[PDB]
Write a protein that binds this ligand. Structure first.
Ligand SMILES: CCCCCCCCCCCCCCCC(=O)OC[C@H](O)CO
Ligand SMILES: CCCCCCCCCCCCCCCC
Ligand SMILES: *[C@@H]1O[C@H](CO)[C@@H](O)[C@H](O)[C@H]1NC(C)=O
Ligand SMILES: O=S(=O)([O-])CC[NH2+]C1CCCCC1
Ligand SMILES: O=S(=O)([O-])CC[NH2+]C1CCCCC1
Ligand SMILES: O=S(=O)([O-])CC[NH2+]C1CCCCC1
Ligand SMILES: CCCCCCCCCCCC
Ligand SMILES: CCCCCCCCCC
Lengths: 280, 97
C-alpha cells in the first residue's frame, strides 16, 4: 500500500501539587497499543508476542535504561525549576515518534502539550516554543536548547532512525496480525424516536478488521439519502464497530435493508431487511 | 481549557437474553485526564472491567475504551457512568438493546 504508517510513544503526567505527581506511558502502532510501561519497575510491557519488533534484548534494554534516565532527569529538573499553589494541578502530554511516508521517507516528531495546549515541538535540531504557550514555552525550550545538548542529539537519533527501524520491525514481526481479515456481524435495532409517526432504523456492524467498511441503508439497489454513519468505534481485540442510521416515516420503512461490504466478506455482502413491528 | 467527555455505549454482539456478550463504553474528547469511568449493573459498579491505557488525539483530548463481559437478561439494566471536573454531576448513559 501507499498508506502512511506511524509509531508513537506517548507520556502523560500530572503534578497534583508541588511534591506529588503521577504518570503513564505507552507505545502505539497507528491506533493499536503495542507497549505499556510499568512505572514501579520502570520497564517496558510487551503486549503482543511480536512487540519486540525484531530488536535484540540488548537494544531494548538500552532503550529501557534511556527512558529511565529521561524520567529521572525530568523529575529532578521539574523539582528544581518549579512553587505557587495556583499553578497546580497541571498536566503534561508528550508524543514522540515517526511517520513513514509512501515512498519510505521517514519523518520524526516530538511534541509537547501543557494543560491541553501546544507547548513546544522538536524541529530539525531545535526545540521550538509554541507562540500560544508564551513564556513557559520559551523557558522550557531555553533549558532544552542550551543545557541538554546530548539530550537533543539522542532525541534526534531516536525519532529519525531508531523509530522507523522499530516500526518496520514491528510490522514484519506482527505480519500475521496486521494482515489479518476479521469478518463482521451485523444486526438491526430501533434507535431513539425521531418524532411522532417516525422511526429510527439502526444497522449495527461489529467485529470487522481492517477498518475500511461500507454500510448503507437501501431500497433495492437505491441508496437511501438520509443514511448517517456514526463514528467507527473500537472493540477489544482490535476490531471495530459502526452504526448506520436512517430516519423514516411510519409506513415507509418496509422494504428497506442494510447492506454491508467488507474486504473479509469475499464478495458476499451482508443484507438485513427491516422487520420492526411489520411481522405479527 | 477543560473539555467535557463524550460517552458512547455499545455491545460487541446483538443482545440475546442469557447469552454471554461484551459491553463497551468509549469515553473521548475530555481534558484533563483525571476521570472516573464505571460500568454499572443495576446502578452498582462492575469490578471485572478492562480498560485501554490512556491515549489522546491530535487536539490533545483524551480517550479510553472500557469493556466488560456480561450476560444480558430482561431484568438487568447496564450503564456507563462518568465523573469529571467539567461535569456538575456524574453522567450516566444507559445501554439499550
Ligand atoms: C521515541 C521513539 C522510540 C522508538 C523505539 C521505541 C521502542 C519501544 C518503546 C515503547 C515503550 C513505551 C513506553 C514508554 C513510556 C514512558 O517512558 O513513560 C513513562 C511514564 O512517564 C511513567 O511515568
Ligand atoms: C512552572 C510550572 C510548570 C512546569 C511545566 C514543565 C513542563 C516540562 C515539559 C518538558 C517535557 C520533556 C521534553 C523533552 C525532553 C527530552
Ligand atoms: C499532594 O497531593 C497528593 C496526591 O493527592 C497528596 O497525597 C498530598 O498530601 C499532597 N501534598 C500536599 C497537599 O502538600
Ligand atoms: O507510578 S508513578 O508514581 O505514577 C510514576 C511517576 N513518574 C513520573 C512523575 C512525573 C514526572 C515524570 C516521572
Ligand atoms: O494511525 S494514526 O491516526 O496515526 C493514530 C493517531 N492516534 C495515535 C496518536 C498518539 C499515539 C496514540 C494513537
Ligand atoms: O484497519 S486500519 O486502522 O486501517 C490499519 C491501520 N493500522 C494497522 C496496521 C499496523 C498495525 C496496527 C493496525
Ligand atoms: C531531561 C529532560 C529535562 C526536561 C526539563 C523540563 C522541565 C523544566 C521546567 C522549567 C520551568 C520554567
Ligand atoms: C522518547 C521519549 C523521551 C525519551 C528521551 C530520552 C533522552 C533523554 C536521555 C538523554
Amino acid at each position: 500500500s501507499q498508506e502512511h504508517v506511524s509509531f508513537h510513544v506517548i507520556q502523560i503526567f500530572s503534578f497534583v501539587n508541588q511534591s506529588w505527581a503521577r504518570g503513564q506511558g505507552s507505545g502505539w502502532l497507528d491506533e493499536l497499543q503495542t507497549h505499556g510501561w510499568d512505572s514501579e519497575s520502570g520497564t517496558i510491557i510487551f503486549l503482543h508476542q511480536w512487540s519486540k519488533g525484531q530488536f535484540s534484548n540488548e537494544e531494548l534494554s538500552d532503550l529501557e535504561l534511556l527512558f529511565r534516565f529521561y524520567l529521572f532527569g525530568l523529575t529532578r529538573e521539574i523539582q528544581d525549576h518549579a512553587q505557587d499553589y495556583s499553578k497546580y494541578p497541571f498536566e503534561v502530554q508528550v508524543k514522540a515518534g515517526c511517520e513513514l511516508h509512501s515512498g519510505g521517507s521517514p519523518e520524526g516528531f516530538f511534541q509537547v502539550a501543557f494543560n491541553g495546549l501546544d507547548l513546544l515541538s522538536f524541529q530539525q535540531t531545535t526545540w521550538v516554543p509554541s507562540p500560544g504557550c508564551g513564556s513557559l514555552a520559551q523557558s522550557v525550550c531555553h533549558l532544552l536548547n542550551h543545557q541538554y545538548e546530548g539530550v537533543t542529539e539522542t532525541v534526534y537519533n531516536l525519532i529519525r532512525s531508531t523509530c522507523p527501524r522499530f516500526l518496520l520491525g514491528l510490522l514484519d514481526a506482527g505480519k500475521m496480525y496486521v494482515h489479518r481479515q476479521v469478518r463482521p456481524e451485523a444486526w438491526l435495532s430501533s434507535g431513539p424516536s425521531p418524532g411522532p409517526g417516525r422511526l429510527q432504523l439502526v444497522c449495527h456492524v461489529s467485529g470487522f478488521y481492517p477498518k475500511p467498511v461500507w454500510v448503507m441503508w437501501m431500497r433495492g439497489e437505491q441508496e437511501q439519502q438520509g443514511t448517517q454513519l456514526g463514528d467507527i468505534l473500537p472493540n477489544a481485540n482490535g476490531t471495530w464497530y459502526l452504526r448506520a442510521t436512517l430516519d423514516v416515516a411510519d409506513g415507509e420503512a418496509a422494504g428497506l435493508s442494510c447492506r454491508v461490504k467488507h474486504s473479509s466478506l469475499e464478495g458476499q455482502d451482508i443484507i438485513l431487511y427491516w422487520r420492526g413491528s411489520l411481522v405479527p | 481549557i477543560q473539555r467535557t467527555p463524550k460517552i458512547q455505549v455499545y455491545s460487541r454482539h446483538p443482545a440475546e437474553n442469557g447469552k454471554s456478550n461484551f459491553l463497551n463504553c468509549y469515553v473521548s474528547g475530555f481534558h484533563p485526564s483525571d476521570i472516573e469511568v464505571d460500568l454499572l449493573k443495576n446502578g452498582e459498579r462492575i469490578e471485572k472491567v478492562e480498560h485501554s491505557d490512556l491515549s489522546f488525539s491530535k487536539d490533545w483530548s483524551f480517550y479510553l475504551l472500557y469493556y466488560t463481559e456480561f450476560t444480558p437478561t430482561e431484568k438487568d439494566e447496564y450503564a456507563c457512568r462518568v465523573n469529571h471536573v467539567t461535569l456538575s454531576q456524574p453522567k450516566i448513559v444507559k445501554w439499550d438493546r
